[PDB]
Amino acid sequence: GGTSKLKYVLQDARFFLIKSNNHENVSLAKAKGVWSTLPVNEKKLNLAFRSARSVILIFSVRESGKFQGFARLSSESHHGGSPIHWVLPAGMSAKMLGGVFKIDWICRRELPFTKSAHLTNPWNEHKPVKIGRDGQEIELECGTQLCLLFPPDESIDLYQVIHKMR
Template identity: 40%
Template sequence: MNAFLFIHSSFQHIISHFVSFHTERIRAFRAYSLTSPTLSAAPPARFFIIKSWNMQNVIEAQRDGVWATQEKNTEMFAEAFHSCRSVVLLFSVNKSMAFQGAAVMTSPPSATVPQPAFCKKLKWPTSPPFRIRWICTTSVHFKFVGHLRNMYNPNDDGEPHAVLVGKDGQEVSTSAGEGVVEILRARDGEARGEGDRP
């Protein structure tokens, strides 16, 4: 009888450990963010194109971790920040024919966030500034992402434009956005020499 109780107790301990282990895995999955190494299990996220007048503004944003968009995008970005787990911004300098990196919003637009330096030079109103955390900062030419189609930006025939087509604030469908981030990350790794590691 004692042997039976011992086996039963051991079995319960194993089951308890198994449940605890998988509960932690589920919690980790739910806490997964786009700063993780892979995108295959990413939670709900929204992607947007950010257009910059020049590269200097992007360099300063990479250094300071703040940005401001056009005033008309304020409500859309605030709503996105509060309604999903990750808001990913795909940066592209006008006429550069490239993406210059991707960042995640870490705050909604707010007057309490320091204003980016470039805002002082503008002659039109912007959104309140917001904080961002960069995922990758290496440029990728449009030719490497042209095969990705943005389902949220159809042409006159109803066919989706390539992801590289879009004005400031253009939302990007999840598959295309994840594809751009994956390519940017791969190029980021190459720039750091990770591709040469055994």
């Protein structure tokens, strides 16, 4: 129903864990529909955006014990546009995060790691899906089920994110 529309968005997607060292940038991403990541992940995501039906980013603040939501990647990274002043972690320069992706939030509700305890990611040595570095790719079925575990977000029109797929 709502689950059917979501299943359509997730069909044949590639799934990536996104980690943030702070809460602030995830809130900023929720506010403005943008994300930046470090250089290896930026190339990985640009390549996936071009080749995959959908690219899904599942956000988790480092040490928060939760995921904070997930979103569909809606562009490759754009440089030299209107800049985003991210909250940089100690030792991270603004240039390390260069390149801004547009993203379309699907769910901005939290999912505690306890609710994902039955899911392991075979593409990360079969570790619980809550374990992974920034950018860790999640196997299709594991990633699909992780997204379907999140509560419905009644402020996100899932008809609208689908329309945006053109």
